[PDB]
Amino acid sequence: HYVEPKFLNKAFEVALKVQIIAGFDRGLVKWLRVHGRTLSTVQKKALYFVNRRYMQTHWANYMLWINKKIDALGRTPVVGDYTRLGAEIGRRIDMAYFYDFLKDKNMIPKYLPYMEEINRMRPADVPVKYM
């Protein structure tokens, strides 16, 4: 039986998703220490979902950047290279600027069943589609 190759080794994909969501969530905890008392429980959960959805809709873009960086290492890539690239994305995107917008423009998403399903997943299992 033939094996379909993955477009990115699963250990590498996991290293990336874990670091990007941990970085996005860290910035959200810092913002919620200021604003958490003015938001309901389901609004707070919807903002953790926004983090996961932001990674999913920008995944093809991040892969363009990641591959440019990996194709340039001049040695074979190890999972630590993806852990370091993923931590860089997770740190650099200043998501608090987007949380301020959603709160101030009253656009936090209404919390829906699908959002809770995404939120309950391990960062490692959040589904991404390739480009």
Swiss-Prot record:
GO cellular component: acrosomal lumen
A Pfam family that the UniProt record links to this protein: Egg_lysin
The entry's keywords: Cytoplasmic vesicle, Fertilization, Signal
Subcellular location as annotated: Cytoplasmic vesicle, Secretory vesicle, Acrosome lumen
Tissue: Sperm (at protein level).
Disulfide bonds: none
Keyword field contains Signal: yes
InterPro entries in the record: Egg_lysin, Egg_lysin_sf
Assembly and interaction partners: Monomer. Homodimer. Molecules associate into dimers and then rapidly dissociate again. Interacts (as a monomer) with the egg vitelline layer protein VERL (via VERL repeats); each VERL chain can bind multiple copies of lysin.
Known function: Creates a 3 um hole in the egg vitelline layer through which the sperm passes. Does not have enzyme activity. Species-specific interaction between the sperm protein lysin and the egg protein VERL exposes a basic surface on lysin that may dissociate the egg vitelline layer via electrostatic repulsion. Plays a role in ensuring species-specific fertilization.
Name of this chain's protein: Egg-lysin
Annotated source species: Haliotis rufescens
